[PDB]
């Protein structure tokens, strides 16, 4: 076994290369997302900054997991980044709608990953959720719930324009 | 009788009780109104603020009267602090209206207490209302019936969102 | 279910409800214990210092947990927040062993609402508990049974005037 | 009748006159108290302090008074002051019973006056009252009863010498 590995199961080593593979897909989403915002006939740059925003946070998330990784002993298994599901993101409601259910997907993976540690009494896996991982994606749910109830409320039109310069400057 | 006590009569020792306990409620009834505008589906953080500073004030306003019973030679005796008559609020419009409503009740009930004082020649109660409670009702209920107003101005939808940026930051 | 809501048991989320009375009712009996020590008959300032912060803390900690409620998307229900049991609450003494039975019973409460979100794989609660609330209470009971041994050791009289000086200041 | 002279009764001339000297009055009774405790044998430098503080805000309760005689067009009149009761004023806890019953019998002058005014619809005085005379009295009556509180919990001996040190500076 590798020089640190200790009390690390096989399976959790598993999940956390899957874990990375899932955070750096979110990046692609939402980089494909802040693009699209930056379209001549979209033209919303406060819904580009914070999609750019949230891609560089998801880029930031896999690298930790990767530093997890190598802390632990595991190895480091990538995988292709898959497209995103489509190439053009709608309305800046829909596209913060996507972002909620994409978050909501990223929770349950985290979620269930916690679940595989405590069953191997994998403390140090535990701590690692609670302090990087499963508060920072609640956080992230609550917001966006946040962001869609306010695009609905202020409708499209100037509801959205006005969204982008208040909400999201 | 107690050290400090003098030109104290029972029956305004009695309404300072009382009072702490309607600031209490008043204190409670803003706590509630703050926390339903930061539910997902509310999501309006000026009027959460906004009410949560009123709730801040209140518990101010009572605590004031607590030291005010213990500076006359009173005894301060708590009572139970109500739930609200509502759990939820509903729109902006509609809390501004319900708390401009408690407002004119509090301050009823602090006239109330002053005529009791002055029937009883208590000047220095007079004194503790006018430089500490009747100026302040006066100008929360200015304050509000202009934000009733102006949230019918503004009307649903966008108007409510704007408000929130606007006169709420 | 609420945009949200994820891995949050109803039985968590009404725990939440009653951890959340729980503080509100710690606050009210620390906030009567502030001002008895106000009282010209008892007058110890540093008493009255130190049950205001207490009052003001549990506040806080009752806020947090309203926002923790919304945040996961849970429902604030609100219920009466009942008088304390007594009126006035004796010498410093006799007043930091109510607080310290208090504090061990808001414990208590703490401690069964993780062992239930521990029972649902509530790994987020786990954390808020661990992050916000448990140590903190470790550290309350600690801080006033330090005061109580201290209070026994000074006696009464000049004793309790000089711990209210140098370890109240 | 003199230039200034409007809605000002001959009566509250008068009082404004007794309390003048009742002022005065209590200004030498805390002067003889100040150096009452720094005599050798009674030797008390917080007490001093204290006392010499308030002689001299009574000398300015008086003072304050005459200009506001001035001010109404009224006619200062003085009187003798009479000497204190005593040559010597006991223990610190002596002494700060004399203060308080003083404190009180100075406030029912004022609160005497007060109604005198009343009765005449005289706002100006009303008010003069209030801003800086009857809520000083209340406060100085509360601090003294707070002070009697204490020098009776700590006792003689080395517990008045400590309040000398600890309450008193
Ligand atoms: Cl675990
Ligand atoms: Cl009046
Ligand atoms: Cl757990
Ligand atoms: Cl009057
Ligand atoms: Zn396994
Ligand atoms: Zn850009
Ligand atoms: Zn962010
Ligand atoms: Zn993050
Ligand atoms: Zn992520
Ligand atoms: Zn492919
Ligand atoms: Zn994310
Ligand atoms: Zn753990
Ligand atoms: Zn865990
Ligand atoms: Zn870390
Ligand atoms: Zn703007
Ligand atoms: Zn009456
Ligand atoms: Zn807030
Ligand atoms: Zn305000
Ligand atoms: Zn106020
Ligand atoms: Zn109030
Ligand atoms: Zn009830
Ligand atoms: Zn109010
Ligand atoms: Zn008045
Ligand atoms: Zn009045
Ligand atoms: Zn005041
Ligand atoms: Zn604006
Ligand atoms: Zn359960
Ligand atoms: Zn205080
Ligand atoms: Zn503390
Ligand atoms: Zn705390
Ligand atoms: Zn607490
Ligand atoms: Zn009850
Ligand atoms: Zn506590
Ligand atoms: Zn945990
Ligand atoms: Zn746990
Ligand atoms: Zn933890
Ligand atoms: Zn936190
Ligand atoms: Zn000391
Ligand atoms: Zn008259
Ligand atoms: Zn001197
Ligand atoms: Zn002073
Ligand atoms: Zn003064
Ligand atoms: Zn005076
Ligand atoms: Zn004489
Ligand atoms: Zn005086
Ligand atoms: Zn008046
Ligand atoms: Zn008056
Ligand atoms: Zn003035
Ligand atoms: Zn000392």
């Given at each position: 076994?590798?020089?640190?590995?200790?009390?690390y199961a096989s399976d959790v080593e598993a999940g956390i290369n899957k874990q990375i593979n899932?955070?750096?897909?979110?990046?692609?989403?939402?980089?494909?997302?802040?693009?699209?915002?930056?379209?001549?006939?979209?033209?919303?740059?406060?819904?580009?900054?914070?999609?750019?925003?949230?891609?560089?946070?998801?880029?930031?998330?896999?690298?930790?997991?990767?530093?997890?990784q190598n802390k632990r002993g595991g190895r480091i298994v990538l995988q292709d980044i898959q497209?995103?599901?489509?190439?053009?993101?709608?309305?800046?409601?829909?596209?913060?709608?996507?972002?909620?259910?994409?978050?909501?997907?990223?929770?349950?993976?985290?979620?269930?990953?916690?679940?595989?540690?405590?069953?191997?009494?994998?403390?140090?896996?535990?701590?690692?959720?609670?302090?990087?991982?499963?508060?920072?994606?609640?956080?992230?749910?609550?917001?966006?719930?946040?962001?869609?109830?306010?695009?609905?409320?202020?409708?499209?039109?100037?509801?959205?324009?006005?969204?982008?310069?208040?909400?999201?400057?």
């Amino acid at each position: 076994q590798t020089q640190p590995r200790q009390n690390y199961a096989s399976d959790v080593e598993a999940g956390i290369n899957k874990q990375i593979n899932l955070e750096l897909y979110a990046s692609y989403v939402y980089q494909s997302m802040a693009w699209f915002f930056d379209r001549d006939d979209i033209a919303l740059k406060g819904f580009h900054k914070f999609f750019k925003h949230q891609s560089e946070e998801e880029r930031e998330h896999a690298e930790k997991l990767m530093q997890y990784q190598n802390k632990r002993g595991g190895r480091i298994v990538l995988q292709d980044i898959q497209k995103p599901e489509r190439d053009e993101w709608g309305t800046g409601l829909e596209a913060m709608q996507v972002a909620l259910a994409l978050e909501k997907n990223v929770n349950q993976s985290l979620l269930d990953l916690h679940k595989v540690g405590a069953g191997h009494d994998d403390a140090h896996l535990c701590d690692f959720l609670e302090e990087h991982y499963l508060e920072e994606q609640v956080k992230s749910i609550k917001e966006l719930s946040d962001y869609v109830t306010n695009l609905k409320r202020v409708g499209p039109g100037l509801g959205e324009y006005m969204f982008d310069k208040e909400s999201l400057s």
